[PDB]
Amino acid sequence: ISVRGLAGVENVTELKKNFNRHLHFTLVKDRNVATPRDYYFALAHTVRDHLVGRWIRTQQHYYEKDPKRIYYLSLEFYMGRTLQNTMVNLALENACDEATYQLGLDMEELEEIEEDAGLGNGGLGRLAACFLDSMATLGLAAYGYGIRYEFGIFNQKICGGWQMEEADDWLRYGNPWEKARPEFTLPVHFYGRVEHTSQGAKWVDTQVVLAMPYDTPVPGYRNNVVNTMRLWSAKAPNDFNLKDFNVGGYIQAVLDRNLAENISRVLYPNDNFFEGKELRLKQEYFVVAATLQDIIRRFKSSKFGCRDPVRTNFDAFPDKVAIQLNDTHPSLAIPELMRVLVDLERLDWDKAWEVTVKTCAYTNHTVIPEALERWPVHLLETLLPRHLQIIYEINQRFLNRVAAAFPGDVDRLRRMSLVEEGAVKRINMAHLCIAGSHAVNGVARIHSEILKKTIFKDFYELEPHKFQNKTNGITPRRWLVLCNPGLAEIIAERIGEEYISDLDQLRKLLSYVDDEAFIRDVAKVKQENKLKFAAYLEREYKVHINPNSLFDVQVKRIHEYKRQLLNCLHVITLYNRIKKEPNKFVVPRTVMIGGKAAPGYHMAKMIIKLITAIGDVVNHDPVVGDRLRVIFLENYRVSLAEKVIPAADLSEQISTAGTEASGTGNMKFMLNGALTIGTMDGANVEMAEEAGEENFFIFGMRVEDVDRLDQRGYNAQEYYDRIPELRQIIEQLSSGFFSPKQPDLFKDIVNMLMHHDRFKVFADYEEYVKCQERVSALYKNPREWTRMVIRNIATSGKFSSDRTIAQYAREIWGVEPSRQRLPAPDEKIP
Amino acid sequence: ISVRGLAGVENVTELKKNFNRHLHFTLVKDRNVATPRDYYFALAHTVRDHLVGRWIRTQQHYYEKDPKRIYYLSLEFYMGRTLQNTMVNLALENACDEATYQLGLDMEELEEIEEDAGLGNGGLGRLAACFLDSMATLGLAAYGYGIRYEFGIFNQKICGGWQMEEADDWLRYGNPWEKARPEFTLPVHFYGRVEHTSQGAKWVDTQVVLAMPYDTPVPGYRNNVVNTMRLWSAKAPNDFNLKDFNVGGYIQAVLDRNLAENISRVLYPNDNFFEGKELRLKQEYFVVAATLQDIIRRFKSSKFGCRDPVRTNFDAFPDKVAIQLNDTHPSLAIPELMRVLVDLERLDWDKAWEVTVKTCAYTNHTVIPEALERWPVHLLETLLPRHLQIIYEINQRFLNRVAAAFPGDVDRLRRMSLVEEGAVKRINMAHLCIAGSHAVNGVARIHSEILKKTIFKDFYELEPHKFQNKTNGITPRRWLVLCNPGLAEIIAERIGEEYISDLDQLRKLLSYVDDEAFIRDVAKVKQENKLKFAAYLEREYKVHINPNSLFDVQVKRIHEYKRQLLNCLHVITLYNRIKKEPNKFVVPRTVMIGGKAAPGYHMAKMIIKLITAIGDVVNHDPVVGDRLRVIFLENYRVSLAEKVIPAADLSEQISTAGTEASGTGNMKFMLNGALTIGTMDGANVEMAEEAGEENFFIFGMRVEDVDRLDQRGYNAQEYYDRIPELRQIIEQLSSGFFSPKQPDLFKDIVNMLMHHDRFKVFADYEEYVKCQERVSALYKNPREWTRMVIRNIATSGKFSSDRTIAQYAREIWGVEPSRQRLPAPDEKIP
Ligand SMILES: CC(=O)N[C@]1(C(N)=O)O[C@H](CO)[C@@H](O)[C@H](O)[C@H]1O
Ligand SMILES: CC(=O)N[C@]1(C(N)=O)O[C@H](CO)[C@@H](O)[C@H](O)[C@H]1O
Ligand SMILES: *Cc1c(COP(=O)(O)O)cnc(C)c1O
Ligand SMILES: *Cc1c(COP(=O)(O)O)cnc(C)c1O
Incomplete structure (x- = not known):
């Protein structure tokens, strides 16, 4: 039929019964009322069954061996359908085709029923998805971290020759691939104020939004490696979002929960354009704050959460962690890493900064001005007070570095500032990323050169070593x-x-x-x-x-x-x-x-x-x-x-x-x-x-x-x-x-x-x-x-993208790719 | 151990492996990271497995035999935990106890983890739940129809001796018992206006809210009968709730969807008290409108959707359908049944009325004035225009009946009116129910007598045959x-x-x-x-x-x-x-x-x-x-x-x-x-x-x-x-x-x-x-x-409640209870 794998005798038989098990027990349907949509789900579940075994051992594996972890932060992940792709990476395509054929169904007709996971606008979002697939294929301990929008890119309709937009309710019928993990919910803060007391600053009187993770498996190509894509969902706490008493209405209070949960409701449909809305910024800190807590927790366990030098020495943090910033959207990860390190862990500024710069890397995806993120200071001021303070402090020390390198170059100083004066003061997120990252890269040879020659010329002259190129794939x-x-x-x-x-x-x-x-x-x-x-x-x-x-x-x-x-x-x-x-x-x-x-x-x-x-x-x-x-x-x-x-x-x-x-x-x-x-x-x-x-x-x-x-x-x-x-x-x-x-x-x-x-x-x-x-x-x-x-x-x-990822791995993350098959999926239950 | 059933050799072994299957494949966990909550779910899923087989044949059965269907409409269903209850009705308690014991777990400790299904305030809600259990036990083709609130009765907290209310997020971790049925989503209208054209009135320019059903199985006691409780969930259409163009904002439009979906967000926490809020009324028409479409669809198929006299003769509607109104909350079912019959099916008023009165029955649960539902006319006027017209028309004909029975009794006329004059005109929902139902009943002997002697005296004198009693159980x-x-x-x-x-x-x-x-x-x-x-x-x-x-x-x-x-x-x-x-x-x-x-x-x-x-x-x-x-x-x-x-x-x-x-x-x-x-x-x-x-x-x-x-x-x-x-x-x-x-x-x-x-x-x-x-x-x-x-x-x-239901069955619904075991659960796959 093609090289979509082998249509083994034992496996086709096995598939069929499982297809039936699910149709009955999972979908609670009987052949006489089942519709193509039902058949599509029975299959999806049957296929998903095949990679849970591998998903569990892969994750368990990384826990035992404890390799350096790669964290790909992106507000976008343009996944698309995942049934076929899963069958392909698992060498299950022909077997499934055969089995469904014997069950009297056209597999292709069923594949057309799966809704696209359109959590992306275009190229930037799709890169992230291809990257994930490549990182799994190359056996990297990598995690895709993002937001689980309930509404992805809008479905386009042409009416009278004009585009009409309509909500993309991709979860309407359920998502058989994701696994809700309510047990790992984390809190995220907003607003509040900063208190400076005796031994440190304190972020106080904040509004809390909870972040619930959902894990989706990312199978490598025929190597038994199944990585994880963790998407965050906004949830309102049941206390203050009800408990802040003294009249308002009990009903209204419950209805108002959909105000904290709006954070992960919809993706901003902009491609190469910057819109400075508060909601967007909120989405940006939400994914950053939650993800980082997850990263540090994993680190605290590692092999340090057993022994090692004994003393939470974050000196080995960059040896165990690497976070990639897909554009400036997750840029707040830099100041947020500092906040935790300095405010909560109590590391001295300089040690904290060293660690941060050593674990962060930034990828630039455009040179057009209207796509550059410049957030008004009054926004950061109100929403993330302590982060603004950190940014100013970062800016202060950075500019001092510049002045020292280029004595008297006063224009250079204003040009490089993370803070832009004018109508309204803004924070140049890009400048932030460059300063707090050990590597910055373009997505194509010419693009990379343009960055050094133009847009980031001054930064290049200051630290030429930081700039690289990584042509997309x-x-x-x-x-x-x-x-x-x-x-x-x-x-x-x-x-x-x-x-x-x-x-x-x-x-x-x-x-x-x-x-x-x-x-x-x-x-x-x-x-x-x-x-x-x-x-x-x-x-x-x-x-x-x-x-x-x-x-x-x-x-x-x-x-x-x-x-x-x-x-x-x-x-x-x-x-x-x-x-x-x-x-x-x-x-x-x-x-x-x-x-x-x-x-x-x-x-x-x-x-x-x-x-x-x-x-x-x-x-x-x-x-x-x-x-x-x-x-x-x-x-x-x-x-x-x-x-x-x-x-x-x-x-x-x-x-x-x-x-x-x-x-x-x-x-x-x-x-x-x-x-x-x-x-x-x-x-x-x-x-x-x-x-x-x-x-x-x-x-x-x-x-x-x-x-x-x-x-x-x-x-x-x-x-x-x-x-x-x-x-x-x-x-x-x-x-x-x-x-x-x-x-x-x-x-x-x-x-x-x-x-x-x-x-x-x-x-x-x-x-x-x-x-x-x-x-x-x-x-x-x-x-x-x-x-x-x-x-x-x-x-x-x-x-x-295998080539691109291999390069990121070696030249930026400091990890070695491997095409080694993970030890089969084989049962096991310890 | 007790008579919680037999702990068979083969079944305990079978249970255990399925418990394990779910822990692995469904929960995607391994014994080394599983928490009591995980163990509770593995079990729940294992138990739920046992009644899907029966659920499917029960429903299929009713389709073949086609008996008279009982529809219990209630805005409340106080279910509580359902794991144990399911094990008990399925004679699975000891086997599960044994199996979990062998797996090294305390079943009782796991049962405490299940969240209560608190979709009720108190007695009225709990009655509905006991009734459901009784109707299944007595082998009646009965369906519980309600709203799937995402927030049930608030969790009470005592702070400083004072009660503090906090949201009851009962779905936070998922509900293993329910089955989303997005494929059966129905549309529900609101607002709009009435157009009177040539051959009939038309409800026009309405706002549409979709109703998504969720089915929860209701197992009878050891008789293999598993009935269905269908709960409706509000969903916004993706068109108009985005498509009504000409500026407003695309993002805002998507965020505003949580305005139509608020309808099924929270239960009103009132026990024996009437609050005339628009939201409440909206919940009341929502459950009514959706449910009725489901009832009529099922009827159109029956054995009429094959042959019979051939001609959608609704004359046999009351012979096939019976809807019970749990209090006046679902009272709009009466005028809504008329609307469909007259407006859409085009039956003459009198034939429509005959059918309606013959299929509807009302149950009264209180005599205190503050708990009586009296909806301001301006509300009905704005939200449900055509229904108001129907009510006035019902009122008109009813009062004419009264005048004819009691000539000259002008005070009686105003007293019995469905319309109450005064500060603001209201509609006395109770009066509506009595007029459009063939039976009205109290919930205790004394209560029933009080109704005839007091509150509904005039109605009793008019139609003594309608009033009965059905002591709760x-x-x-x-x-x-x-x-x-x-x-x-x-x-x-x-x-x-x-x-x-x-x-x-x-x-x-x-x-x-x-x-x-x-x-x-x-x-x-x-x-x-x-x-x-x-x-x-x-x-x-x-x-x-x-x-x-x-x-x-x-x-x-x-x-x-x-x-x-x-x-x-x-x-x-x-x-x-x-x-x-x-x-x-x-x-x-x-x-x-x-x-x-x-x-x-x-x-x-x-x-x-x-x-x-x-x-x-x-x-x-x-x-x-x-x-x-x-x-x-x-x-x-x-x-x-x-x-x-x-x-x-x-x-x-x-x-x-x-x-x-x-x-x-x-x-x-x-x-x-x-x-x-x-x-x-x-x-x-x-x-x-x-x-x-x-x-x-x-x-x-x-x-x-x-x-x-x-x-x-x-x-x-x-x-x-x-x-x-x-x-x-x-x-x-x-x-x-x-x-x-x-x-x-x-x-x-x-x-x-x-x-x-x-x-x-x-x-x-x-x-x-x-x-x-x-x-x-x-x-x-x-x-x-x-x-x-x-x-x-x-x-x-x-x-x-078996006694109570047996009485409703014989004296009101016209069906005969049966303690006959349905033909085993046995596999089968046609
Ligand atoms: C800012 C942004 O999203 N940029 C873009 C794109 N809009 O797809 O990213 C992708 C992926 O790197 C590149 O291939 C495009 O040339 C670049 O413009
Ligand atoms: C209006 C209402 O809810 N009434 C009540 C109750 N509040 O529980 O219903 C239940 C169930 O019929 C009765 O036992 C109570 O006496 C009655 O008051
Ligand atoms: C690859 C891809 C893109 C990016 O296209 P370019 O031609 O690089 O702008 C956008 N959308 C989808 C659906 C894609 O698959
Ligand atoms: C049975 C029950 C009720 C009703 O109690 P009454 O004593 O009849 O007012 C209320 N709440 C719960 C939790 C119940 O089980």
Whole structure:
């Protein structure tokens, strides 16, 4: 059937009965009233059964051996469905497929019932998930720590061409994977005031919110290691949240509990944008405060909570602990670690600071100013008083270091301050992270360099040793084996299976680049994938597409810097050229654009309306026929990504040079047989470098060109004046060609494009369409197109998260990865 | 060990492994980190496993045979713990005891970990629970329908002698018994307006709240029947509760979902008191609207949803359905049934009305005015517009019936109206129920008569056939076998086990009233029970009592009509007499008073402070020694009731004649070997009548005396003037003898007692203490005390809920009870 494992005789029989046990005892249903949803749960529970054994021994193991623990703090974890992924890492896919088949059910039909765990906005959240999968696969004692939002990223609905947001109640039917651990609930404080008494400061009169943990298992790839992702849930104490007496109402008091519990109610739907709301800050301290207590407790036990030097010496803390800050969201971990160490454990400042800097590491994910976290001091002042004091004290000592290093450089001082003066004083979270961490890293080579050259230049000059780079990656398991079994099979037919956990081995495929059979096969799976997607489209969304055309797709969150607008310009151009010479042949294309706009991002929502507007015109023009279709992929999410990517021919990664930190979608397309048309931005540079620029469609300004233009000054009118085709499009938008009933509907877009385009869309127009012509040319030559594809696929190995994690492990955490199978799952009950 | 069943070889082995399976796979724990709480859950799950098989066949059975269904609508279901009760009804107690013993665990210690299901205030809620247990035992196709509050009755805390309320988060650790059934979620409407168009009225522009059901199994006693208790939970739709666009905030919109979900958040903590809050009304329509849809759906399938006459003829509705209204709380079921029938199903008014009256029955639980539900019309007007219209129309036709029966009786007309004029117009829910039901019943013989003679006299004269009586009962299982295995064993040793489901058989114990061995045994178990309680007291609450003294206890909700105050007067009197003649012998007593005061009931809370105040004095007076202790039982609840009742010698049921509808606590004491000192009120009358007044301690005014006094006019001063002892007590309270630091602390009580005592406490003082002297006399004669006890126990059979339910079944529902064992639980998987 494929290498989804063995369909053993004994195990298929075993599976079936357990499937039945659960249907009866767990779901309390009988075959005569069970629905697909019930069948999905019976299975889920049956599968979950298989990793509890391993989950328990893995955790017990780490307790015995006591290795250095890695803690990945992130406000986001974009998990997606977990049934299939679990079967894959446990080599259970074929057995389950067989068993369910014998039970008379279609496993695939059941997998579609699982709701996505959308606790993330996009790239940052998905990285965290791939990282988790990689850390388990590499046998690291790592824990993902976050918030268990009851409402993840909103489900996108297109009404009249406009995006409509609706609550994502992903827990509505229950989450068979998580394990509530009410017994480990911890208290978290808010507000209050600071008392300075005799021997130390005291955080007093605080409001208490409880943090209840929920554990979700993270299985490594076929190595019997199952790590833990601990998500926190806000709960109100039953005392003060009722006991603070003297009139108000008993009923009202109970109803008001949903005020402390609002903290973990919903994820903020912003991608690369900073919103300074109190709720957000509260979420940020909540996950930090709870997690740290859990970390220190585990440490207090270790082998110190037995003997060792005997005396809670936190000198060995950094030797046992390592916490990674995914962006600045969990930045309060730094001052909070100091608070505990200094205030509660009573360590002297300097010893506390040494420990903190040695255990903390920060990862930066963007350079755009609007995405930088700058919290108003009055907020910190009211909500976390003692933390503010600590930050000022950190700032004080840091600046003293600077002054000592650069005597007289008074401007440098203000520039590096963690405190920003002006309208309202703010705290530059990024500056905080750099100062209190031993390592800071970019997510792509160019991005990392930009940090040292620009944004954090002064910090680099002060401590060059802190700055590193760790190019992002993705997991081959979910992003290849899971979503593209067909491609994985033919690859395995030639080079084996060892590449699943050693993606570099894909290079061996280079020697098949001229293999007639292979070329045919690679080409075949992609054709099958396109057919399956084309079907899914009519199945769930309804209104036909042509599987023979080139599948042109751009899927990622809607942003001005992502330039979906530039994509739009090309599409309209194609249309206009066809309308000019109808009977001229052109390579058929189905351009698919998908992604979510943050609810408050007016421009982004305007762009979605534009895309749909273009399709209304293009898709109903008889002269165009089936040569050009414009489709807006609805509710783009992980599960949807696993369907389109494998079916894509052309991958669009066209951000303005210098704006996309790295990107990971791009990597997903490269590994699944799609060619890339893009700019020398983020990881695109390393991809083309890895596959050779001849096998990549690069175009547009490089970072330097962008800057040159900015010195000069960017004037869009010039491009409007010199390019007729471009002019024609702008005037079409301005006159209502795409919005008859509302002729001025797109004035904001046009206005912006002409007068305040921060991302100079026009500057890359000419080179972009020219380049698009080159890909159409190559598509006309199937054999050569496929051969270039083989060149990309065979060379994408470097982009596996296993590599990224291996690097974090060695160069930052100080731990050695291991592909050693944990001692089987075997029963055991001590 | 006892007759808790057989500890079979095969089953104990089977239990153990399943206990282990759950500890591992379900709890995901290993013996080395498992806590008593974990062990409790492993067991619970193991036990729950045993009744799913039966639950499924029972439900499937009713589907095949299709008998008349009984629907018990109640806003309250005071369940308590369910582990033990389940083991008992499944004959699993000894086996579990053995198995857990072999696993090295104390089953009793684990049972104490289960949280109480306190979804009730007191008697009304507990009746519903006993009824459920009886209906299952009698093999009726009955369903308990209610609301799944996430917060039940508040946990009571005594701070400085004052009651402190704190949220009862009973679901904090999960509820292993319930089964979420998200697939059966139903919509419920609120607000909107009524449109009258061509062919009928339309309820329009309504706000939708979803109702998610949760099923809890209700096992009959050893007959393999497991019925269902369906509790509804409020959920917000993800559309409009987000989709009603045009600014407000996406985050805020998601946070505001906890506004529709507040409906099932907390139980109103009022016992015998009406609070007209909107939230309450919303809870009332919520449970009604959802339940009815579920009832009609089931009906539409029946055997009509196949063939029969073919044409949804609701003429057979009352032959298949019967809904019981537990008090007026679910009263909206009447107008809602009409709404559906007339508005949606399109039946003519008269046919709809005939059907409704034929399927609805109402049970009245009180005569005090402040407990009567009178909803302001403006409320109904805004929240349920169409229902108000229906009510007016019902009222219109009803009054026309009255006018026709009593021509010219204009006063009668206003008196019977469902609509009450005055300050604000109200709707008399009780009047509604009577009019739209074919049967109305009291909960005790005297109570029922009072209804016909007083409160509902006019209604009785109009339709005498509607009024009946159904004396309350209690379940012998939880209230004897479960809480008092010792007593149950010795009884069984003589007369067998058949009395557990046939309590009348207890009469056979009469012939052992002179049996020397029995007398010794009855006396022995009560001594053991008192010792166990005396221990529990020091264990969990701490501060000694004497097990040789008479256990004088009054436990029930705190009320002015319950007269805990009268109890107080006696206690103080005893104290004063002792302080007068210290070296005179008096029978030692431990008087225990316990119960919860509704948070807004100032007087009731004042009384709790008085009780504790008395104990502060009495318990620390050296001259008193161990002859008199005053103890306030904290957080009285079902689980606590199962501990005190079996340990009680004297049961206090001293309400003012005519105020306690029936009472059930009294019955609980009678069956567990306690003698009763009480007034001829509620079921007390039938108890003494059943055991013979010679074996009862009756005292005080009868109903007639009360009325005589009211004609005359009640003047407390007279009693104050003629009884020195009474005077002495009042002046002690007035001067701060019981409240040194705050001498005027009890002015409200004294003032009330002297000028506005609605329950004439003073009028029964003299006869009460005189009577108390008689019980002390008899206690001095162990052999005779025990013999009188045997007379009560042997004669309590009539008070089993099996009898009550059998009567409802035959005289109201039109169904025949059956003690037929359902065809085993045996595997089966069709
Ligand atoms: C701030 C933020 O979330 N940044 C982003 C992204 N929005 O996904 O993180 C991911 C993961 O590192 C990178 O691939 C993107 O280029 C970067 O912009
Ligand atoms: C209105 C109400 O709840 N009434 C009560 C009670 N409060 O428990 O119901 C129970 C059960 O019928 C009766 O035993 C009490 O005498 C009656 O007062
Ligand atoms: C990988 C992924 C992303 C990130 O995409 P980029 O192209 O790097 O912006 C966002 N959303 C989902 C659903 C993803 O799988
Ligand atoms: C039986 C019971 C009641 C009712 O008591 P009465 O004495 O009839 O007022 C109230 N609460 C609990 C906990 C009960 O078990």
